[PDB]
């Protein structure tokens, strides 16, 4: 239903890091419930990380709009800070 | 040295400043203590989980201790406990008096552990930890500062750790090691032994029911200064040992008092049958003072 993003300002290892807040609004009348929601958003958030640049870190979040709840994915695979 | 910092507009902010600060207001604090009590080290909390002794191995629960050099940990509040000390090499022994070690400062600097190893241990370890902003609603990770504790036994090299003894280990009937029942760390709070507080007790007990026994007998010089000095002690032993919460000097200067008196009808014993307090070694004070009175109030 809507594609909508922020920046993120967050820390880790006590360095700043910039990263994305990817925010998706779905029907869940599409989905057969959150067996579904759950692994498109899967897919979604591991297209994301192949698709964002880099020295940017990126969270998926998906609003279920019939309830108003969400699933959030707030996790980084990458290599980083090596020093 | 401690150099204290010039706050001043146009000064530049530096950690030298802080590091610096905090050594002035820590020698500012002893200073007081020191106006009162000779001395203001010692053990507060000792506090042991026993019951893996059977498998070799001691581990404390909970530590608060002065040391000497006016440092002070806190497990409760601000410190680490010490990694689980190993006993599996003492097999051979029958009796391991464990101390607290804490690696002294470096004049020259390098007293933070960075992770590599040294002749000389670091004194200061840095850790990630979550804190609560007190004023707000928000959380953030921050640097702080642990003491570099261990436990290691007094058998052992110890030149390059400032010490406290903290628990003895003795063998058992069944080959076991357990808490020797009488044992004291140098106390900086009464409470922090109770095996002392108890053999208190029951000097108060037998206090009050020799004091009582001769009251109702009320040439009798004898019985009116027994009862003048009992009497007298009474009032004021009562408090200090009601409420076990504070330096242990206080109390030995009452109890010598007690002895000191009782000792003047006395035959049977020596002049010099009072002890000198020896804050290192409590065990070569108390529980001598303490078998004294009960001899002196017996008799």
């Given at each position: 239903?809507?594609?909508?993003?922020?920046?993120?300002?967050?820390?880790?290892?006590?360095?700043?890091?910039?990263?994305?807040?990817?925010?998706?609004?779905?029907?869940?009348?599409?989905?057969?419930?959150?067996?579904?929601?759950?692994?498109?958003?899967?897919?979604?958030?591991?297209?994301?990380?192949?698709?964002?640049?880099?020295?940017?870190?990126?969270?998926?979040?998906?609003?279920?709009?019939?309830?108003?709840?969400?699933?959030?994915?707030?996790?980084?695979?990458?290599?980083?800070?090596?020093? | 040295?401690?150099?204290?910092?010039?706050?001043?507009?146009?000064?530049?902010?530096?950690?030298?400043?802080?590091q610096?600060?905090a050594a002035?207001d820590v020698?500012?604090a002893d200073?007081?203590?020191?106006?009162?009590?000779?001395?203001p080290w010692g053990v507060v909390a000792a506090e042991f989980d026993?019951?893996?002794?059977?498998?070799?191995?001691l581990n404390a629960t909970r530590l608060i201790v002065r040391f000497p050099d006016g440092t002070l940990i806190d497990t409760e509040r601000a410190d680490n406990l010490p990694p689980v000390c190993?006993?599996?090499?003492?097999?051979?022994?029958?009796?391991?008096?464990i101390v607290l070690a804490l690696p002294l400062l470096?004049?020259?600097?390098?007293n933070l552990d960075?992770?590599?190893?040294?002749?000389?241990p670091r004194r200061w370890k840095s850790e990630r930890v979550n804190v609560?902003?007190?004023?707000?609603?928000?959380?953030?990770?921050v640097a702080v500062l642990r003491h570099n504790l261990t436990l290691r036994?007094?058998?052992?090299?110890?030149?390059?750790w400032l010490t406290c003894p903290v628990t003895?280990?003795?063998?058992?009937?069944?080959?076991?090691?357990?808490?020797?029942?009488?044992?004291?760390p140098?106390?900086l709070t009464?409470?922090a032994?109770?095996?002392?507080?108890?053999?208190?007790?029951?000097?108060?007990?037998?206090?009050?029911?020799?004091?009582?026994?001769?009251?109702?007998?009320?040439?009798?010089?004898?019985?009116?200064?027994?009862?003048?000095?009992?009497?007298?002690?009474?009032?004021?032993?009562?408090?200090?040992?009601?409420?076990?919460?504070?330096?242990?000097?206080?109390?030995?200067?009452?109890?010598?008092?007690?002895?000191?008196?009782?000792?003047?009808?006395?035959?049977?014993?020596?002049?010099?049958?009072?002890?000198?307090?020896?804050?290192?070694?409590?065990?070569?004070?108390?529980?001598?003072?303490?078998?004294?009175?009960?001899?002196?109030?017996?008799?």
């Amino acid at each position: 239903l809507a594609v909508q993003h922020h920046r993120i300002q967050r820390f880790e290892k006590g360095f700043l890091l910039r990263g994305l807040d990817v925010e998706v609004t779905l029907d869940g009348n599409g989905f057969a419930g959150e067996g579904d929601i759950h692994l498109f958003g899967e897919m979604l958030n591991r297209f994301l990380a192949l698709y964002a640049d880099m020295n940017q870190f990126n969270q998926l979040t998906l609003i279920v709009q019939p309830e108003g709840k969400c699933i959030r994915w707030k996790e980084n695979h990458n290599p980083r800070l090596p020093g | 040295k401690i150099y204290r910092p010039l706050w001043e507009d146009g000064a530049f902010l530096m950690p030298q400043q802080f590091q610096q600060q905090a050594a002035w207001d820590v020698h500012l604090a002893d200073s007081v203590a020191r106006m009162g009590l000779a001395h203001p080290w010692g053990v507060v909390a000792a506090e042991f989980d026993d019951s893996l002794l059977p498998l070799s191995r001691l581990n404390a629960t909970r530590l608060i201790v002065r040391f000497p050099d006016g440092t002070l940990i806190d497990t409760e509040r601000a410190d680490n406990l010490p990694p689980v000390c190993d006993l599996s090499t003492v097999s051979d022994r029958s009796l391991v008096d464990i101390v607290l070690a804490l690696p002294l400062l470096n004049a020259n600097g390098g007293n933070l552990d960075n992770g590599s190893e040294s002749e000389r241990p670091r004194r200061w370890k840095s850790e990630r930890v979550n804190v609560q902003e007190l004023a707000g609603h928000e959380q953030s990770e921050v640097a702080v500062l642990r003491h570099n504790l261990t436990l290691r036994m007094a058998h052992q090299e110890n030149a390059a750790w400032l010490t406290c003894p903290v628990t003895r280990l003795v063998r058992d009937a069944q080959g076991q090691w357990c808490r020797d029942p009488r044992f004291i760390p140098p106390l900086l709070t009464l409470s922090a032994s109770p095996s002392l507080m108890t053999e208190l007790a029951e000097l108060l007990h037998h206090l009050q029911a020799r004091r009582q026994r001769l009251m109702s007998m009320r040439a009798d010089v004898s019985l009116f200064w027994l009862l003048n000095a009992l009497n007298s002690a009474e009032p004021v032993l009562k408090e200090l040992l009601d409420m076990p919460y504070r330096h242990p000097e206080l109390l030995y200067r009452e109890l010598a008092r007690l002895a000191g008196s009782l000792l003047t009808f006395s035959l049977e014993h020596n002049v010099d049958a009072v002890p000198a307090y020896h804050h290192e070694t409590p065990e070569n004070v108390f529980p001598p003072l303490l078998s004294l009175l009960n001899r002196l109030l017996e008799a």
